[PDB]
């Protein structure tokens, strides 16, 4: 419900924009209180997050924690050293 | 020389105060930037009565704008004539009064009045010969009725000789917009009477009656109401600014208008109120003014003068005219309505003439009146005050501030004593 | 006030003198909160009389 | 600069926070991620270094699920991750759980977060607290937080928006207990209360808005409209700007009388609005009709004490004046002897905005009423009747005594609210 209202902003393309009459059902026939949208359900990155979290388990990951912790750094990420003494 | 200091407090005084500075900036011909773009010489000879000289041909208003909440200070800065006011002249608090007379007068106004007293003393020392002080505020707020009425107590002790007048806004009984309204007013009237030379009681109700009937505008907002108040503010001080056939000043009427320092409450009126549709069809003479200004429907306060006796009357004329039927019509209204005047003061009408007209209108006139009918409005507050006070309602807001209970009694005793001796001066 | 009702006299007298919202403003009260221009100084384009 | 801090506690508090913060972001124009693509906007949204604004609210709930829903919603990047606080276990419709054993674990964390928020803000206008009397969390945690907040900030105003249990319908059975025993906190550590029930707003939505089957969000949008109508005078400009302190003084006569009544107008749909012409007279006449209260009580059987009117939009003081005079010329509406003047009018200029997918039509003008009146005495009279009818047989008491509170306070609470209604009868007495 919270995803339907706040996340989706009540995005129901099948529902008409305005309301009209109905004759026998002495009401205004369209009604957003029923007929939800039943589109692709409430989803976000958590599926893939869990999939990676358990896929990255069964690997032959022999190595020292030193070598897996200290790789070769990019030359782009070096410090620019703006403030320095000489001219 | 003859300078005027305009004190400005509260949501009320800030709005009409900005409105007042808009009118007199037009007449003296200053743009909102600060340069003199008028044409006549007489526009700029005595500009220094409200305006202070600045380098580069600039002029700054000599006004002090205060409010215990900072929201209005952004608004007046955001007005049409918003940049003209000096940034140091803005002194503002963080917490509002809550329509609480006690909070603005003792709790939080106490820390701020020194800041207001600081700028005023420098304001006072800047002018060579200050003629007096001027304040616009609300008797029904928390700041003007509260801290503002505190400022009156301090400067009067500091500057005794100078004349101060209050263009205050009284509540109406027919319409009110505050439940605790009679508490602040009853706690305000007790202070003005002690130290104020003359008071111009302005009613918000009668102004709505004016624009509905006299001017017949379909949606006059608050800005139109402030204009008619702004019109009166310029109308009283015009003979000071310009030459006249017979001039006057704030003392020439204040001395002439009060027989006793207790009787100092006044009822201010404006003469030339005609609808926009039929302006070209209007005739402009002395008679139709006198028939207009003495009518009760024209009046800007909530008392019918037909129910009281006129003690003294002061009228200041604007417009180059001569005096003969100006003098004659004052006699015609005097002898005809002889019952509506008191008899122990002969020739109770005061007239004053200034030569210049306003912009766009060849003539103007401003009426200042002391009547018995102003005493009726005060009794209406007491009838409201006692009913709420007898049940001690809404009182813990005042009680929890360190105030005692007897100050409510003495203020009730004062204005009851005022209307007691005011009534005996009717008979 | 094309319809003749409830002060249509003044409404048609100042039908265009007051109605100038330049298509950004959506409320006459907000546009005229400061005060109505055409009041007590009709044709406000006359300078001070220099005659004393 | 004026700043208000929101104290949303409980599941109801979190949901009303969702609706109100959606409306605030919309009306200021804030993106849901937290970027700006007259108004003040500083009172609620606080700048950060990267040009991003962070709301000044604290969401606390003792069940993690509802807060996690917002943590995984659209507004996940808008609220500060420290601002939203959760507990593993709830109070589960128990004041004793909400007050004596479960709250004390996280009271200090909540107070530290509030202290940081108050240190960020410069001029704090006050604390707006949202909760419900029925829920264990919404009663207990609100009570303990309020009693500690009172000693932390003596002079700061503490306003309450509370969901009162309805006269007939109920979402639980043990709620009269919690609603009875939260009264001490809401009576001595409070400044004003805004009790609402769900039943009256159900009726109002069915009757005027024509939505035959309202859900909780249909109420939450209306509550958000109430709070925006309240704080518009802080947010924007107007002829008569009003403040929290302004209406506390104009609405509380006595220290034991701080329960005004909430009312909103106009509340209609687009099909109604297109053909019904909305004037200030009509909206102020609708706002006084007893069929338009947010709480189930007839003011015709009570007596008005004080009213705060909040107008907003293309509203004019003269038609306000005619409205008020017409209201006063009525024998049907009554006022007490000691309140000859009982209206406080506040005016704002910015017209209320509309949430897409909403229910209210786009209206140029709006009004809100806060009416302190004595007709709400019957509500606690019914509450007292039902509380005695259950307590006489000591029902459900073992849960409380086992959680660790003593039983004399039961009778103490009953005596307390009996004294409350006695004082309300005292005020309703006229000195004629
Ligand atoms: N108007 C409105 N009322 C709500 C909403 N959510 C909950 N309530 C009210 O809250 C009451 C129940 O309290 P809850 O918030 O569910 O529970 P709690 O306050 O967290 O206390 P615990 O159950 O112990 O955790 C119900 O009686 C509802 O009337 C809402 O979204 N809108
Ligand atoms: N005539 C007039 N009255 C005003 C104006 N602004 C505010 N008021 C009145 O001032 C009263 C509220 O004043 P308030 O803000 O509480 O004063 P403060 O508390 O002393 O700052 C209201 O009753 C208004 O009628 C204005 O521009 N013109
Ligand atoms: Mg819960």
CB D10 near ligand 1, within 6 Å = yes
- Of D355, D350, D114, D325, the closest CA to residue D221 belongs to D355
Structural domain harbouring B301? 265-374
d(Cα D185, Cα D183) in Å, to the nearest integer? 5
| Whether the bond into A87 is cis, omega within 30 of 0 | no
- The Å distance, Cα B226 to ligand 2 centre, comes to 11
Residue (of B95, B11, B68, B99) closest to B394 by Cα position: B99
Same structural domain for residues B173 and B304? no
| D63 touches ligand 1 (CB under 6 Å) | yes
Q: How far apart are the first and last CA of chain D?
A: 47
Could you tell me if B393 and B369 lie in one domain? no
Domain boundary among the residues B257, B277, B292 is at B257
CATH number at residue B145: 3.40.50.1440
Q: Which two tokens stand for residue A43?
A: 């989803």
Q: Same domain, yes or no, for B365 and B380?
A: no
Which residue in D370, D353, D364, D397 sits closest to D308, CA to CA?
D370
Q: Check: CB of residue D184 under 8 Å from CB of residue D151.
A: no
**Contact exists between B and A (3 or more beta carbon pairs < 8 Å):** no
Token pair recorded at residue D353:
């905005």
Q: What is the resolution of this structure in A?
A: 3.5
Other residues' Cβ atoms within 10 Å of the Cβ of residue D273: 15
Q: Say how far residue D173 (Cα) sits from the centre of its chain.
A: 23
How far does the CA of residue B81 sit from the closest CA of chain D (Å)? 17
Q: b/e for B365-396, b at 16 or more Cβ within 10 A? A: bbbbbbbbbbbbbbebbbebbbbbbebebbbe
Yes or no: say if D156 and D110 are a contact pair by the CB < 8 Å rule: no
List chains adjacent to chain A, taking adjacency as at least 3 C-beta pairs closer than 8 Å.
D
What is the sign, positive or negative, of the torsion defined by CA atoms of A40, A46, A47, A48?
positive
Assess whether B302 and B409 both reside in one domain. no
> Is residue D168 helix, strand or coil?
coil
Pocket-testing residue among D233, D239, D240, ligand 2, by greatest number of atoms within 8 A of Cβ: D240
CB D264 within 8 A of CB D229: yes
CB contact under 8 A, B358 and C49: no
**CB contact set of D426 (below 8 Å; sequence gap of 6+):** none
**Residue D208 marked in a binding site:** no
Angle, CA D138 vertex, CA D133 and CA D144 arms, to 5°: 105
How far does residue D431's CA lie from ligand 1's centre (Å)? 42
* Intra-chain end-to-end CA distance of chain C, in Å: 45
Judging contact as 3 or more Cβ pairs under 8 Å, the answer for D and B is yes
Contact partners, residue B415, CB within 8 Å, separation at least 6: B186, B189, B190, B193, B378, B381, B382
CA distance D38 to A70: 54
For this PDB entry, the determination method is: cryo-EM
With contact defined as 3+ CB pairs under 8 Å, the chains touching B are C, D
For residue A10, what are its two tokens? 């009540």
The DSSP 8-state label assigned to residue B161 in this structure reads S
Residues B180 and B247 in one domain: yes
- The H or E element spanning position B364 is strand B364-371
Given B235, B257, B279, the domain boundary residue is B257
- Residue whose C-alpha is closest to residue D86's, from D107, D63, D117: D63
Q: Are residues B391 and B245 in the same domain?
A: no
Virtual CA dihedral for B37, B43, B48, B54, nearest 10 degrees?
A: 10
In contact, B65 and B123? CB cutoff 8 Å: no
State the sign of the Cα–Cα–Cα–Cα dihedral A76, A77, A83, A86. Answer: negative
- B58 φψ region: left (φ > 0), alpha (ψ -120 to 50), beta (else): beta
Tokens 């599941």 label which residue? Answer: D11
Q: What is the length of chain C?
A: 52
Question: Do B85 and B198 have their domain in common?
Answer: yes
Closest CA to B236 of B202, B212, B287, B262: B202
- 3-class SS at D84? strand
Q: How many residues does chain A have?
A: 87
A-chain residues near D212 (CB < 8 A): 27, 31, 33
Question: Is-cis flag, bond preceding B423, omega within 30?
Answer: no
Contact D51, D69 (CB under 8 A): no
Contacts of B53 by beta carbon, 8 Å cutoff, 6+ apart: B59
Name the DSSP letter for residue B45: S
Count of helices and strands (H, E) across chain A = 3, 0
d(CA B150, CA B139): 12
Q: Which two tokens stand for residue B249?
A: 């000043």
Tally of CB atoms within 10 A around D28: 16
Q: Looking at the complex, does the CB of residue D239 fall below 8 Å from at least one CB of chain B?
A: yes
How many domains is chain B partitioned into structurally? 3
Q: Give CA–CA dist C34/C19, Å, rounded.
A: 15
Q: Are residues B250 and B344 in the same domain?
A: no
One domain for residues B360 and B387: no
CATH (domain of B312): 3.30.1330.20
Contacts A32 to D, Cβ<8 Å:
211, 357
Residue D313 forms beta bridges with which residues?
A: D365
Q: How many CA atoms lie within 13 A of D239 on its CB side?
A: 28
Positive or negative: CA dihedral B79, B85, B88, B89: negative
Which of B213, B237, B257 is the last residue before a domain boundary?
B257
Residue numbers of D annotated as active site: 246
Residue B407's CATH number: 1.10.287.600
State how far Cα D248 lies from the chain centre: 14
Phi, psi for D415 (deg, rounded to 5) = -60, -40
Examine the domain organization and report whether B22 and B136 are in the same domain: yes
The runs of H, that is alpha helices, within B161-249 are 181-192, 204-209, 222-236, 238-241
Does B222 lie in the same domain as B190?
yes
Say how many CA atoms lie within 13 Å of B192 toward its Cβ.
32
Residue D333: count of CB within 10 angstroms of its CB: 13
Contacts of C27 in chain B (CB under 8 A): none
| CB within 8 Å of B122: residues ≥ 6 apart | none
- Indicate whether B112 and B44 sit together in one domain: yes
Instruction: Tell me how far apart the alpha carbons of residues D293 and D203 are, in angstroms, rounded to a whole number.
Output: 10
Pair D399, D333: CB distance under 8 Å: no
Burial bucket for residue B324 (CB in 10 Å: 0-12, 13-18, 19+) = exposed
User: Taking CB atoms and an 8 Å limit, are D18 and A2 in contact across chains?
Assistant: yes
Cβ count within 10 A of residue C20: 9
């Amino acid at each position: 419900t919270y995803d339907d209202h706040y996340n989706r902003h009540n995005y129901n393309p099948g529902l008409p924009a305005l309301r009209t009459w109905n004759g026998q059902k002495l009401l205004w026939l369209p009604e957003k209180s029923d007929f939800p949208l039943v589109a692709p359900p409430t989803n976000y990155g958590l599926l893939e997050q869990l999939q990676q979290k358990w896929l990255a388990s069964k690997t032959s990951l022999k190595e020292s924690i030193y070598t897996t912790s200290y790789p070769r750094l990019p030359v782009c990420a070096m410090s620019r050293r703006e403030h320095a003494i000489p001219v | 020389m003859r300078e005027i200091v305009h004190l400005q407090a509260g949501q009320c005084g800030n709005q009409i105060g900005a409105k007042f500075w808009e009118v007199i900036s037009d007449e003296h011909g200053i743009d909102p930037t600060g340069t003199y773009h008028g044409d006549s010489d007489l526009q700029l000879e005595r500009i220094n009565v409200y305006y202070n000289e600045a380098t580069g041909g600039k002029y700054v208003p000599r006004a002090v704008l205060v409010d215990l909440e900072p929201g209005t200070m952004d608004s007046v800065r955001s007005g049409p004539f918003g940049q003209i006011f000096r940034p140091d002249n803005f002194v503002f608090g963080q917490s509002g009064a809550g329509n609480n007379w006690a909070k603005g007068h003792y709790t939080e106004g106490a820390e701020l009045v020194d800041s207001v007293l600081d700028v005023v003393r420098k304001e006072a020392e800047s002018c060579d010969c200050l003629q007096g002080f001027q304040l616009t505020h609300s008797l029904g707020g928390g700041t003007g009725s509260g801290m503002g009425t505190l400022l009156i107590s301090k400067i009067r002790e500091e500057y005794p000789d100078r004349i101060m007048n209050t263009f205050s806004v009284v509540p109406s009984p027919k319409v009110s917009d505050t439940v605790v309204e009679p508490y602040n007013a009853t706690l305000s009237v007790h202070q003005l009477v002690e130290n104020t030379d003359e008071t111009y009681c302005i009613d918000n109700e009668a102004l709505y009656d004016i624009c509905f009937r006299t001017l017949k505008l379909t949606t006059p907002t608050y800005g139109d109401l402030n204009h008619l108040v702004s019109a009166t503010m310029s109308g009283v001080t015009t003979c000071l600014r310009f030459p006249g056939q017979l001039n006057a000043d704030l003392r020439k009427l204040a001395v002439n208008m009060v027989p006793f320092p207790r009787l100092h409450f006044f009822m201010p009126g404006f003469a030339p109120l005609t609808s926009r549709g039929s302006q070209q069809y209007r005739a402009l003479t002395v008679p139709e003014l006198t028939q207009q200004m003495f009518d009760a429907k024209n009046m800007m306060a909530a008392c019918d003068p037909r129910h009281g006796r006129y003690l003294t009357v002061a009228a200041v004329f604007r417009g180059r005219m001569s005096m003969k039927e100006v003098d004659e019509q004052m006699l015609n209204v005097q002898n005809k309505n002889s019952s509506y005047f008191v008899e122990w003061i002969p020739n109770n009408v005061k007239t004053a003439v200034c030569d210049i007209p306003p912009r766009g209108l060849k003539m103007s006139a401003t009426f200042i009146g002391n009547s018995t009918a102003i005493q009726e409005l005060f009794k209406r507050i007491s009838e409201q005050f006692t009913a709420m006070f007898r049940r001690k309602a809404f009182l813990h807001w005042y009680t929890g501030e360190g105030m005692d209970e007897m100050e409510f009694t003495e203020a009730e005793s004062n204005m009851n004593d005022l209307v007691s001796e005011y009534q005996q001066y009717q008979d | 006030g094309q319809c003749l009702l409830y002060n249509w006299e003044e409404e048609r007298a100042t039908n265009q003198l007051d109605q100038i919202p330049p298509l950004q403003d959506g409320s006459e009260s907000y546009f005229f909160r400061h005060g109505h221009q055409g009041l007590l100084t009709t044709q406000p384009q006359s300078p001070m009389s220099s005659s004393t | 600069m004026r700043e208000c801090i929101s104290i949303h506690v409980g599941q109801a508090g979190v949901q009303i926070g969702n609706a109100c913060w959606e409306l605030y972001c919309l009306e200021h124009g804030i993106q849901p991620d937290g970027q700006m693509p007259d108004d003040s906007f500083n009172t609620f949204f606080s700048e950060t270094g990267a040009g991003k604004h962070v709301p000044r609210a604290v969401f606390v709930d003792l069940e993690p699920t509802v807060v996690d829903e917002v943590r995984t919603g659209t507004y996940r990047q808008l609220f500060h991750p420290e601002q939203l606080i959760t507990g593993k276990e709830d109070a589960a419709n128990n004041y004793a759980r909400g007050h004596y054993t479960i709250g004390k674990e996280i009271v200090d964390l909540v107070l530290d977060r509030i202290r940081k928020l108050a240190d960020l803000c410069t001029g704090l206008q006050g604390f707006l607290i949202f909760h419900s009397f029925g829920g264990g969390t919404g009663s207990g945690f609100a009570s303990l937080l309020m009693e500690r907040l009172s000693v932390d900030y003596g002079k700061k105003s503490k306003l309450e928006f509370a969901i009162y249990p309805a006269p007939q319908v109920s979402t639980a059975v043990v709620e009269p207990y919690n609603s009875i025993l939260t009264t001490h906190t809401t009576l001595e550590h409070s400044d004003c209360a805004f009790m609402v029930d769900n039943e009256a707003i159900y009726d109002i939505c069915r009757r005027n808005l024509d939505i035959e089957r309202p859900t909780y969000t249909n109420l939450n949008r209306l509550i958000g409209q109430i709070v925006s109508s309240i704080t518009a005078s802080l947010r924007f400009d107007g002829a008569l700007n009003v403040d929290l302190t302004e209406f506390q003084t104009n609405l509380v006569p006595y220290p034991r009388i701080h329960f005004p009544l909430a009312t909103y107008a106009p509340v209609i749909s687009a099909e109604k609005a297109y053909h019904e012409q909305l004037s200030v007279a009509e909206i102020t006449n609708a706002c006084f009709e007893p069929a338009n209260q947010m709480v189930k009580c007839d003011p015709r059987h009570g007596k008005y004490m004080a009213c705060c009117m909040l107008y907003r939009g293309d509203v004019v003081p003269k038609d306000v004046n005619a409205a008020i005079a017409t209201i006063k010329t009525k024998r049907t509406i009554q006022f007490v002897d000691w309140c000859p003047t009982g209206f406080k009018v506040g005016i704002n200029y910015q017209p209320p905005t509309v949430v897409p997918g909403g229910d209210l039509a786009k209206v140029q003008r709006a009004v809100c009423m806060l009416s302190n009146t004595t007709a709400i005495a019957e509500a606690w009279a019914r509450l007292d009747h039902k509380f005695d009818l259950m307590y006489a047989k000591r029902a459900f008491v073992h849960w409380y005594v086992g959680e660790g509170m003593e039983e004399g306070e039961f009778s103490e609470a009953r005596e307390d609210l009996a004294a409350l209604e006695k004082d309300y009868e005292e005020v309703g007495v006229d000195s004629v």
